[PDB]
């Protein structure tokens with residue numbers, strides 16, 4: 001990753017709190033000044049936190065893709081240590097959608113999902129199994145591009161594929177199950193999967209052949225595709241590259257989205 005000089009960064013406002021310290025909006029001067037998010041490492045970090053902190057930047061720095069958060073660079077030689085990324089104005093996806101409930105077209109929602117899916121196709125090609133794909137780990141920018149975020153060395157049962165739970169077998173097909181749950185998150189404008197059901201109920205339903213119900217006004221193709229992501233046998237779930245392609249068909253022929261799922 002790129003080491004950058006404290007002089008080029010200027011923190012402006014706190015916009016959040018992370019595992020290792022507060023996160024700020026700011027300005028990077030690489031000439032020309034550009035908004036950035038800035039993750040700080042609290043003074044008083046342990047060695048373990050230092051390594052986990054810089055490590056995420058390391059993992060992130062191995063990626064270059066439109067729908068993957070871009071590491072601008074780290075600050076590891078001076079204090080506050082920082083991780084500098086592209087600024088995403090609309091913040092986390094689940095929270096954004098909750099604030100803008102019913103305010104997007106079905107095409108804007110599906111395009112958000114194709115962005116995510118694309119990023120997950122990139123990750124899956126790089127052999128990177130995210131393990132924690134969820135709408136809260138997607139960030140969104142002024143133009144509504146959704147980027148997979150949160151790469152890092154805690155994972156809730158109900159975003160997780162049954163085989164990944166019972167045998168702890170995490171693959172890219174595990175992530176595809178999670179992506180179906182994100183689809184339901186996006187199409188319900190940020191509702192919590194399985195509402196207030198307990199982890200126990202949730203696994204009993206899933207193993208009993210029962211799935212999350214169709215979101216209100218959900219296109220039939222979007223609902224069926226999520227049901228394709230929630231097949232008990234992972235080998236039958238679509239791969240991310242199938243998902244991207246199906247969502248592109250749907251976007252290219254938007255009248256496909258006029259027919260809704262029922263019941």
Ligand SMILES: Nc1ncnc2c1ncn2[C@@H]1O[C@H](COP(=O)(O)OP(=O)(O)NP(=O)(O)O)[C@@H](O)[C@H]1O
Nearest residue numbers: 015016017018019023037085086087088089091092
């Ligand atoms: N690149 C970014 N651009 C814009 N906002 C960001 C960026 N990264 C993080 N944030 C914001 O800062 C918050 C905390 O960042 P992050 O560490 O990535 O999430 P977290 O540790 O899971 N904590 P939280 O999201 O508050 O539950 C997020 O909710 C975002 O609102």
